[PDB]
Amino acid sequence: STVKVTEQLRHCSEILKEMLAKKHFSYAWPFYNPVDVNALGLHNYYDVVKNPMDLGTIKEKMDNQEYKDAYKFAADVRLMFMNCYKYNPPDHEVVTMARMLQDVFETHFSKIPI
């Protein structure tokens, strides 16, 4: 509602658009949707990951205006990467893709106005 916050969220929407861009598909695609625990066979996933997150949910939460400011948004993004890091062994390819995508995110998020 404040302009400061309104502008923070526009920047966040732009950051979300960036990581959804075809440019980053080859390492962003597993984060477009929730981890499909059943289809994949990850019997321990919800034991390890108490709060799943994914880019499609973040897009919908933004669309529903559920982020009060930029840091609430960054927390969901960072939760998504942390979930990947915590569940997978460090050399699984999805962890490399998560690091790559997180470097995209933090590069753009570090420019948000102070």
Ligand SMILES: CCOC(=O)Nc1cc(-c2ccc(C)c(NS(C)(=O)=O)c2)nn2c(C)nnc12
């Ligand atoms: C030791 C093996 O553990 C794992 O396989 N880990 C992960 C696997 C996959 C994954 C694979 C294949 C597909 C088709 C998808 N797409 S979907 C509909 O689930 O989002 C996702 N995503 N992932 C994400 C995030 N975070 N960790 C993993």
